[PDB]
Design a protein around this ligand. Sequence first.
Ligand SMILES: *[C@@H]1O[C@H](CO)[C@@H](O[C@@H]2O[C@H](CO)[C@@H](O)[C@H](O)[C@H]2NC(C)=O)[C@H](O)[C@H]1NC(C)=O
Ligand SMILES: *[C@@H]1O[C@H](CO)[C@@H](O)[C@H](O)[C@H]1NC(C)=O
Lengths: 109, 164
Amino acid sequence: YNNTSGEQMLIIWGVHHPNDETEQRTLYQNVGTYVSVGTSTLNKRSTPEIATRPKVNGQGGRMEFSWTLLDMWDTINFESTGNLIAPEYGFKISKRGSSGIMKTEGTLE
Amino acid sequence: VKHFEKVKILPKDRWTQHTTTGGSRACAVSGNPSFFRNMVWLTEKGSNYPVAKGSYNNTSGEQMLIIWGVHHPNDETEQRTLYQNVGTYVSVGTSTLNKRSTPEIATRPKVNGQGGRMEFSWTLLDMWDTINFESTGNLIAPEYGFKISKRGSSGIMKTEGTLE
Ligand SMILES: *[C@@H]1O[C@H](CO)[C@@H](O[C@@H]2O[C@H](CO)[C@@H](O)[C@H](O)[C@H]2NC(C)=O)[C@H](O)[C@H]1NC(C)=O
Ligand SMILES: *[C@@H]1O[C@H](CO)[C@@H](O)[C@H](O)[C@H]1NC(C)=O
């Protein structure tokens, strides 16, 4: 994706780490897989790690999630032989400014 | 941390598969070879270096420091001796933690006459969470890991001197 938006675009991608070779084969149909992302200011290569873990949400498999901020006119490249969880989207920045994240259990009035 | 409570989560004896005996000349005490008392160096039995699996689910009521290590051989034959298999790996996991390291084989300079190296990573197990081990080789296991007894404000003072 070449970024034409006029602003910076936050972008997120993921990589699956399965619980067995059986998962890996039944999904990705092969092994030794990689996920690879790149930009002008970034090149990152990932090698999905298949082990045994405690179920969480009834799951021993996990997903590792990573993000980059793509500058204007740059271009981002995705290549994987398996285990890629790809972005359908990414978010341009329409408005910047002083802001924050407030931690509260409450609600608006 | 003000007090610890050492608790063995992976006894040497109830691990059947490998030979736990190893320790080398670096850890020698008065010329007598030794090892890390809290740890276990797993190496094969009879040409077989089978799947090494482990688990602990933490009852203890306060959290647990746990350490492990991964062996890095000087040479291919150093590797082949102990673990019997090439392209081995170590994998540890928890609810929050997942790690898998692939051991590295290269010729490295002499420090205490050694081209072998050992790399320790550690975690804090919370309440009720389970820690799992899996290895095709090169693992250095905890026998025990540390329950915290006393929480509290303390420090580590750097000093050469000694208590009076
Ligand atoms: C990504 O696309 C943009 C526009 O689609 C490219 O910007 C143009 O690049 C060409 C070739 O150098 C120039 O002739 C135009 O003047 C550029 N237009 C603008 C508005 O910058 C951009 O070069 C592309 N990315 C890469 C890596 O080439
Ligand atoms: C560990 O033991 C506690 C005791 O009830 C339990 O709540 C927890 O689910 C156990 N962990 C596993 C592996 O189920």
